[PDB]
Design a protein around this ligand. Structure first.
Ligand SMILES: [Zn+2]
Lengths: 217, 103, 125, 389
């Protein structure tokens, strides 16, 4: 709900108490188990799913009030708990798959919460460089974009943002002729964008867990 | 060296005990661990496209000799003392294969 | 000319006292005694064999930089003959080129190279 | 022209690579100005020699090394490989596993051997002017796409010599492209899904990708010249059964009756267009464009382009069978390229025997050497713009 949408890199260098350590670990384990239970009992598109997930997030103190720049409490909670549970779930391959599967559902839910305004800023600020197109370019190439698009019905190129990306980063889309290319740039709507973000998050998380498993002894 | 937490207590039913047959030599054979294949300076294991190294080839020949002895041991109408020699050869190949990792 | 057989069991060497010698102890079947008796055979002239790895380019050891002259096998031979053999009191040897592999834990060694093989008697330093 | 004699190859080859091969341009192109450390010392060349012995891992320190090694030997075939971490000539020195390829130009090899089920004028091993337009079919279809959809600026088209052409994409961001991206690129550019001798190899949905539409528009411009007049794919019943096999069976009788009374392929094609348009209006599948796409679209090989370390024929080489030179194609004048105009190695060597080393100007190789020089000047301009600014 706040700017808690973050790719989990750069492990923290703060120091904390034992009690905070164990409470953070327990809270994150409970949140992940709740995510699994919600995903199994419900589906990922009903109001009950979102309402229960955000209630769980609010109860466990993972999205709340702000403070002076540095010590934003929910951000610190989320960061430290994630990097604590990496150690616990890095041991076995089955545990790694469970941790990766549950962590992406939370990321998808967080991305779904954000309005169509903040996601552009998040994408631009996230890794190094990401960009979108203005209304003039969007209208100029509208027909080509809708023609190249997947089985999405109609010619309604609505208010949903369309993002230009390097073609290579959109490989999984352009190898099957489902996007529009111009000067090596692919124009992609929100759905394929979030699919790409989930794919990169899965890759980075799996690599990080595999690396962590080595330095466990 | 991974040691699983033993379940301390008393057991009523049967206990079946299983052991690995030369875990480390099998690992060396399977993943083609050798001096000429592993890039060193935890190193990454070689891809399966590479051929067998000297050490995996030696272990493979060690098991081939055991295959030969075991097949010759199955032979009937053999000298009664030669069965003993086949048994000792099988044991010797067993300890050699097991201690291959110790080097 | 003359050759006989023996079943060796043990061996012994003395580098400090008698370098370049080996004593093989075994059993020989003798017809006179109708049984196998103990025996020993000494083998001498065990030639020390060394392999020199040539550099890619000649360097000045005092400073530690390249001199612009690529190193061939003749350069290694001359270096050994003039600056190494005389310093360490070596009088006779045999030198040949041999291609050899190496896949072990010594840094900066090619896995296949043309080394210089030099063999000289064990009594020399 | 004059008939090429294969037995004369060992004599003329030495003269050709001694006094006619553009060593300066070759070294310039493969060195790229020496921006990176060892882009030429690590580059691999492959030479096919006498007795069909295949040597693969060759490397040269500089241009003089190339001249000395490739003049005393006179290879029968020359191929260019990738750029490795270690020098190809010292690949056994390093540990087994540290010798790998990282960078190579994007190679698009297109050949007439893939036109077996479409072409009806020559055999699978022969070419003629009435079918070489198929090659031009790809030239304005591929070179445009790489320039337009992907933005590849520097592309060289080279006449392979016998049955096709090659395309070298040498952009700085393209040489370091992964194999998966190369496979995706060739999959996107390939439309004819050739199966196990399946009659239907092309399929189109209601939404037509702009690449497909533009390719059809380009095909439409030259369709009447080659595939309808020069080739006559719709002149006989044995010719048109293959055509109607793509059409749904419910139109087969109407199409055969329409073709029966006609006398030339033009009117047959035009009322086939009318009938297909009527069928689409009543029912679309884009029947008229499907036959264009099956009969004119180039068919690419996934293996050659996907392989980051594949070996492909070098430009300015010599074909052993015919002796033609692997000259670059002038992208400005595409439809005017003439395979029968390309000089033969025997022909160019004969001119030299009839005559600071610039002897290539006096021979017919200069019109292609200047195109190569234009390619390298474009590369130098791009490098200067990207680096000095
Ligand atoms: Zn033809």
């Amino acid at each position: 709900y706040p700017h808690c949408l973050q790719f989990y890199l750069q492990p923290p260098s703060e120091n904390i108490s034992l009690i905070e350590f164990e409470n953070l670990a327990i809270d994150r384990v409970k949140l992940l188990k709740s995510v699994e239970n919600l995903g199994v009992s419900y589906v990922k598109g009903t109001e009950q799913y979102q309402s229960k997930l955000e209630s769980e997030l609010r109860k466990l103190k993972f999205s709340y009030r702000e403070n002076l720049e540095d010590e934003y409490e929910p951000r610190r909670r989320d960061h430290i708990s994630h990097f604590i549970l990496r150690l616990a779930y890095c041991q076995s391959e089955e545990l790694r798959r469970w941790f990766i599967q549950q962590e992406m559902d939370l990321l998808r839910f967080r991305f779904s919460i954000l309005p169509k305004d903040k996601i552009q800023d998040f994408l631009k600020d996230s890794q190094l460089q990401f960009e979108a197109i203005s209304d003039e370019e969007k209208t100029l190439r509208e027909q080509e974009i809708v023609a190249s698009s997947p089985s999405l019905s109609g010619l309604k190129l609505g208010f949903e943002s369309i993002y230009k990306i390097p073609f290579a980063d959109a490989l999984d889309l352009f190898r099957g002729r489902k996007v529009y290319l111009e000067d090596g740039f692919a124009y992609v709507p929100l759905k394929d964008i979030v699919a790409i973000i989930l794919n990169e998050f899965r890759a980075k998380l799996s690599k990080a867990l595999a690396l962590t498993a080595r330095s466990l002894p | 060296g991974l040691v699983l937490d033993p379940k301390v207590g008393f057991y009523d039913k049967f206990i079946l005990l299983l052991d690995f047959n030369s875990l480390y030599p099998s690992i060396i054979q399977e993943f083609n661990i050798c001096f000429t294949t592993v890039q060193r300076v935890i190193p990454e294991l070689p891809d399966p496209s590479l051929e067998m190294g000297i050490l995996p080839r030696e272990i493979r020949k060690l098991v081939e000799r055991r295959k030969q002895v075991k097949q010759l041991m199955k032979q009937q109408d053999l000298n009664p003392d030669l069965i003993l020699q086949y048994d000792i050869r099988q044991k010797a190949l067993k300890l050699t294969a097991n201690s291959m990792y110790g080097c | 000319e003359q050759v006989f057989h023996f079943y060796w069991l043990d061996a012994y060497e003395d580098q400090y006292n008698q370098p370049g010698v080996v004593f093989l102890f075994g059993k020989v079947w003798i017809e006179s005694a109708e049984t196998h008796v103990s025996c020993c055979v000494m083998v001498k002239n065990i030639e020390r064999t060394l392999y020199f790895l040539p550099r890619e380019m000649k360097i000045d050891l005092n400073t530690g930089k390249e001199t612009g002259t690529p190193i061939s096998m003749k350069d290694v031979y001359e270096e050994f003959d003039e600056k190494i053999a005389t310093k360490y009191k070596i009088m006779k040897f045999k030198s040949k080129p041999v291609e050899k592999n190496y896949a072990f834990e010594i840094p900066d060694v090619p896995e296949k190279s043309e080394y210089l093989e030099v063999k000289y008697s064990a009594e020399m330093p | 022209m004059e008939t090429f004699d294969p037995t004369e190859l060992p004599e003329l080859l030495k003269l050709y690579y001694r006094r006619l091969f553009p060593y300066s341009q070759y070294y310039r192109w493969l060195n790229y100005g020496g921006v990176i450390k060892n882009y030429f010392q690590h580059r691999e060349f492959s030479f096919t020699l006498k007795d069909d012995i295949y040597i693969r891992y060759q490397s040269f320190n500089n241009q003089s090394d190339l001249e000395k090694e490739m003049q005393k030997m006179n290879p029968y075939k020359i191929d260019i490989g990738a750029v490795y971490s270690h020098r190809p000539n010292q690949h056994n020195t390093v540990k087994l596993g540290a010798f790998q390829a990282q960078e190579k130009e994007l190679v698009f090899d297109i050949d007439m051997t893939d036109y077996d089920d479409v072409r009806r004028c020559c055999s699978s091993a022969d070419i003629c002017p009435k079918c070489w337009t198929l090659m031009t079919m790809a030239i304005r279809i591929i070179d445009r796409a790489l320039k337009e959809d992907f933005g590849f600026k520097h592309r060289l088209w080279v006449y392979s010599g016998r049955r096709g052409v090659h395309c070298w994409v040498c952009d700085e961001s393209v040489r370091k492209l992964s194999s998966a991206v190369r496979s995706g690129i060739v999959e996107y550019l390939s439309l004819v899904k050739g199966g196990q001798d399946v009659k239907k190899k092309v399929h189109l949905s209601e939404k037509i990708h702009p690449f497909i539409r533009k390719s059809i528009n380009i095909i439409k411009k030259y369709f009447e010249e080659y595939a309808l007049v020069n080739q006559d794919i719709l002149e006989n019943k044995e010719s048109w059964d293959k055509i109607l096999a793509l059409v749904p069976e419910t139109i087969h009788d109407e199409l055969q009756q329409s073709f029966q009374k006609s006398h030339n392929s033009l009117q047959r094609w035009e009322h086939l267009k009318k009938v297909a348009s009527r069928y689409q209006n009543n029912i679309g599948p884009w029947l008229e464009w499907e036959i264009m796409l099956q009969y004119c679209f180039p068919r690419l090989d996934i293996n050659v382009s996907k392989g980051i370390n594949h070996l492909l024929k070098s430009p300015f080489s010599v074909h052993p069978k015919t002796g033609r030179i692997s000259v670059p194609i002038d992208l400005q004048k595409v439809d005017q390229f003439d395979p029968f105009t390309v000089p033969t190695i025997s022909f160019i060597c004969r001119e030299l025997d009839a005559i600071r080393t610039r002897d290539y100007k006096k021979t017919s190789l200069a019109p292609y050497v200047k195109v190569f020089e234009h390619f390298l000047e474009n590369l130098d301009k791009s490098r200067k713009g990207e680096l000095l600014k």
